[PDB]
Design a protein around this nucleic acid. Structure first.
Ligand code: MG
Length: 142
DNA sequence: CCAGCGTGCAGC
DNA sequence: GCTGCGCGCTGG
């Protein structure tokens, strides 16, 4: 399953091969514009390339990097705990994990697994992608 | 200048 | 069902 590239350029389209990275991106996008969040995301992932590294980080350090995005202490703590659970808790869908709600879960189900036909998003950007998928999947041969 | 907002979520 | 978290951007 390869989710198609869309005219809406969701960052999920490029991150789907690594579900942890895609989920971290959703967290970075919580009430934060992609224009701001996505550049900080690459800096984050250079320092913390995997859940293994993030799980062991001090959230106060992560917070310093997240500062210009807002929600910096909240999300720093989320990222550490989410990363821990990702690796050590039994889960089938990531909504079961701390920090991931319907938006992150719907992202995972559209991009990381082939469940897009079952997903009913309530996030505007995801709905633009998901609507467009229904309208074009025949042409794309999905 | 400055009110509103951005691909939310947990805790309550 | 509501609230705290939160910055820089955005555009009048
Ligand atoms: Mg969750």
């Amino acid at each position: 399953w390869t989710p198609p590239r869309s005219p809406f350029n969701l960052v999920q389209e490029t991150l789907f091969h690594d579900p942890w990275k895609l989920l971290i991106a959703t967290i970075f996008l919580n009430r934060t514009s992609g224009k701001m969040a996505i550049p900080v995301l690459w800096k984050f992932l250079e320092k913390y390339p995997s859940a293994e590294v993030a799980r062991t980080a001090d959230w106060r350090d992560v917070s310093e990097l997240l500062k210009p995005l807002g929600l910096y202490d909240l999300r720093a703590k989320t990222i550490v705990k989410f990363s821990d659970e990702y690796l050590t808790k039994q889960w089938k869908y990531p909504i079961e994990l701390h920090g991931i709600g319907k938006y992150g879960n719907d992202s995972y189900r559209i991009f990381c697994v082939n469940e897009w036909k079952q997903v009913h998003p309530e996030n505007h950007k995801l709905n633009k992608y998901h609507d467009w998928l229904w309208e074009n999947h025949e042409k794309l041969s999905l």
